[PDB]
Amino acid sequence: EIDVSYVKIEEVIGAGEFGEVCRGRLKAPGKKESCVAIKTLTERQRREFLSEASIMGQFEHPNIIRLEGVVTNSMPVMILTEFMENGALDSFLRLNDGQFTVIQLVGMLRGIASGMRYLAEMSYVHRDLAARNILVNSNLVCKVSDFIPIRWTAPEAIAFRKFTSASDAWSYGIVMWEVMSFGERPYWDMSNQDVINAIEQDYRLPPPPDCPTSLHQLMLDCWQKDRNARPRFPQVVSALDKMIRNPASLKIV
Ligand SMILES: COc1cc2c(Nc3c(Cl)ccc4c3OCO4)ncnc2cc1OCCCN1CCCCC1
């Protein structure tokens, strides 16, 4: 896919499941240089590493991480994506706690919902939608990546392993809560089993401090026990668009 000579690996910036994550530069003939993130890498594990790229490579949308390419005819094996300067959304928000406006946070959430709308339209169920799996660029554009997390997972998906775009809608509601809380951990220190039991017994997370009531009600809609009752992602995006166009709605807390 990509000639290794076109890749310049700079600073190590993270650790992933199979190895390091680096910042670097991609420069192909006829194209301007671009800034990339690079994951560097068993066989079964090699196919497990590269599977992320083949899934990612199916997609083209401004809120889904762009695959720039792979290095697989050389070693180390590599996956290159567009560089997302602010990294993962949960830790980015914790660093900036209280420092973005409600309208900014809704804009982030709208971008995440558009991504998910596109995945669902493609019949792709994510199963691992969480703030930690969303990356943020220098213009605050949020992009879904990562291609059972109990506290993010719908009760029917936990109980019956039934994963659908409607179980992703449940997870999206949890991401809304993460965002509006500036990256707090869902259900704080409750154990996984306590979370399962609480949800089955009708507990739902409360509105984060300063959270508009209209956003918390959207979270509650996403967390309906009946999966058919949850909003689909087009309705989620349209709900956020209405809130953005009519921002007075976001003042009631
Ligand atoms: C782990 O930090 C970053 C990961 C990024 C990333 N990850 C990624 C995924 Cl999720 C999936 C496949 C990939 C891949 O890289 C190449 O192949 N992709 C793109 N950009 C990333 C940026 C990352 O961190 C940016 C540095 C953030 N840092 C700035 C200084 C203060 C702390 C946060």
Coordinates of N, CA, C and O in Angstrom, one line a residue, residues 63 89 92-93 96 100-115 134 136 139-143 172 175 179 182 240 244:
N63 N -16.2 12.5 10.0 CA -16.1 12.1 11.4 C -15.8 10.6 11.7 O -16.1 10.1 12.7
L89 N -10.6 11.8 23.1 CA -11.6 12.8 23.6 C -11.7 12.8 25.1 O -11.8 13.9 25.7
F92 N -8.5 14.5 26.6 CA -8.6 15.9 26.1 C -9.6 16.7 26.9 O -9.2 17.8 27.3
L93 N -10.8 16.2 27.2 CA -11.7 16.9 28.0 C -11.3 17.0 29.5 O -11.6 18.1 30.1
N96 N -9.1 19.9 29.8 CA -9.8 21.1 29.5 C -11.1 21.2 30.3 O -12.1 21.8 29.8
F100 N -14.5 24.6 27.7 CA -15.3 24.7 26.4 C -16.7 25.0 26.8 O -17.2 24.6 27.8
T101 N -17.4 25.7 25.8 CA -18.8 26.1 26.0 C -19.7 25.0 25.7 O -19.3 24.0 25.0
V102 N -21.0 25.1 26.1 CA -22.0 24.0 25.8 C -22.1 23.9 24.3 O -22.2 22.8 23.8
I103 N -22.0 25.0 23.6 CA -22.2 24.9 22.1 C -21.1 24.2 21.5 O -21.3 23.5 20.5
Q104 N -19.9 24.4 22.0 CA -18.7 23.6 21.5 C -18.8 22.2 21.8 O -18.5 21.4 20.9
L105 N -19.3 21.8 23.0 CA -19.4 20.4 23.3 C -20.5 19.7 22.5 O -20.4 18.6 22.1
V106 N -21.6 20.5 22.2 CA -22.7 19.9 21.3 C -22.2 19.7 19.9 O -22.6 18.8 19.3
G107 N -21.3 20.6 19.5 CA -20.7 20.5 18.1 C -19.9 19.2 18.1 O -19.9 18.5 17.1
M108 N -19.1 18.9 19.1 CA -18.4 17.7 19.2 C -19.3 16.5 19.1 O -19.1 15.5 18.4
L109 N -20.3 16.5 20.0 CA -21.3 15.4 20.0 C -22.0 15.2 18.6 O -22.4 14.1 18.3
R110 N -22.3 16.3 18.0 CA -23.0 16.3 16.6 C -22.1 15.6 15.6 O -22.5 14.7 14.8
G111 N -20.8 15.9 15.6 CA -19.8 15.2 14.8 C -19.7 13.7 15.1 O -19.7 12.9 14.1
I112 N -19.7 13.4 16.3 CA -19.7 11.9 16.7 C -21.0 11.2 16.2 O -20.9 10.1 15.7
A113 N -22.1 11.9 16.4 CA -23.4 11.3 15.9 C -23.5 11.2 14.4 O -24.1 10.3 13.9
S114 N -22.8 12.1 13.6 CA -22.8 12.0 12.2 C -22.0 10.8 11.8 O -22.3 10.1 10.8
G115 N -20.8 10.6 12.4 CA -20.0 9.4 12.2 C -20.8 8.2 12.4 O -20.7 7.3 11.5
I134 N -12.7 7.9 20.5 CA -12.9 9.1 19.6 C -11.7 10.0 19.7 O -11.1 10.2 20.7
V136 N -9.6 13.6 18.5 CA -10.0 15.0 18.3 C -8.8 15.8 17.6 O -7.7 15.7 18.0
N139 N -8.9 21.5 15.2 CA -10.1 22.3 15.1 C -11.3 21.7 15.9 O -12.4 22.2 15.7
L140 N -11.0 20.8 16.8 CA -12.0 20.2 17.7 C -13.0 19.3 16.9 O -14.0 18.9 17.5
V141 N -12.6 18.9 15.7 CA -13.4 17.9 15.0 C -13.2 16.5 15.6 O -12.0 16.1 15.7
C142 N -14.3 15.8 16.0 CA -14.2 14.5 16.6 C -14.5 13.4 15.6 O -15.4 13.5 14.8
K143 N -13.6 12.4 15.7 CA -13.7 11.3 14.7 C -13.7 10.0 15.4 O -12.9 9.7 16.3
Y172 N -23.7 5.6 22.6 CA -23.6 7.0 22.3 C -24.2 7.9 23.4 O -23.6 8.9 23.8
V175 N -21.5 8.3 25.8 CA -20.5 9.2 25.3 C -21.0 10.7 25.5 O -20.2 11.5 25.9
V179 N -18.9 13.4 27.6 CA -18.6 14.7 27.1 C -19.1 15.9 28.0 O -18.3 16.8 28.3
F182 N -17.0 16.4 31.0 CA -15.6 16.6 30.7 C -14.7 15.4 31.1 O -13.6 15.5 31.7
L240 N -29.7 17.2 17.6 CA -28.6 18.1 17.9 C -28.5 19.4 17.0 O -28.3 20.5 17.5
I244 N -28.6 23.3 18.1 CA -27.5 24.2 17.6 C -28.2 25.4 17.0 O -27.7 26.5 17.1

